[PDB]
């Protein structure tokens, strides 16, 4: 699709069999979802943003369906204010910025 | 132009006459620049993100040229590793997400 930016670019995703809402975020290196369990192994990681650093769980090789488009990659789980889809998965679905 | 997301989408902007590097950020409601020495009136604001909140100075009606495309609007000034062009100015340059 083509998404304008008058509102936050929130979309529905599928992860771990569940539906969630998430923000398509060109300013994020990584994909960060609120606290939940995902299948498999994870290891601790720290990531930063405005406000500083937080601790997250790093899950690798997680399938995520983003507005109908498939990705498989790293998902970080922790206390983010909004679920965000970062560049690690935006690249997989072929997302670009255009003007 | 078209900006892919293999790396952070850093572009040249012009603000207060000066060329700087900033991230085109669809996950940002606001534009956040570290330029602590603008003239002009400002008011305090708090903005949040992945680590919590920070204090910033809100400047209104500031011209910001982004890759040759002119914009004018609110710019928040505060500590940040990365200057951020948010949706308040991305909409003015007709930016969209596409996949």
């Amino acid at each position: 699709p083509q998404i304008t930016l008058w509102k936050r670019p929130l979309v529905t995703i599928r992860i771990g069999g569940q539906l969630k809402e998430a923000l398509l975020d060109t300013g994020a290196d990584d994909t960060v979802i609120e606290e939940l369990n995902l299948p498999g192994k994870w290891k601790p990681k720290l990531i930063g943003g405005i406000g500083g650093f937080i601790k997250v769980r790093q899950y690798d090789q997680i399938p995520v369906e983003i507005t109908g488009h498939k990705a498989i990659g790293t998902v970080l789980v922790g206390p983010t204010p909004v679920n965000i889809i970062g560049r690690n998965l935006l690249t997989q679905i072929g997302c670009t910025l255009n003007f | 132009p078209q900006i892919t997301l293999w790396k952070r989408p850093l572009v040249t902007i012009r603000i207060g006459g000066q060329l700087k590097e900033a991230l085109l950020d669809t996950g940002a409601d606001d534009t956040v620049i570290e330029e602590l020495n603008l003239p002009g009136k400002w008011k305090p604001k708090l903005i949040g993100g992945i680590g919590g909140f920070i204090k910033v100075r809100q400047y209104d009606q500031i011209p910001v040229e982004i890759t040759g495309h002119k914009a004018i609007g609110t710019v928040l000034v505060g500590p940040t590793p990365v200057n951020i062009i948010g949706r308040n100015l991305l909409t003015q340059i007709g930016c969209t997400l596409n996949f």
């Binding site: 975020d25 060109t26 290196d29 965000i84 970062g86 | 940002a28 606001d30 992945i50």
Partner: peptide, 6 residues
């Protein structure tokens, strides 16, 4: 890892 503003 840097991750972006609300």
């Amino acid at each position: 890892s840097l991750n972006x503003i609300x």
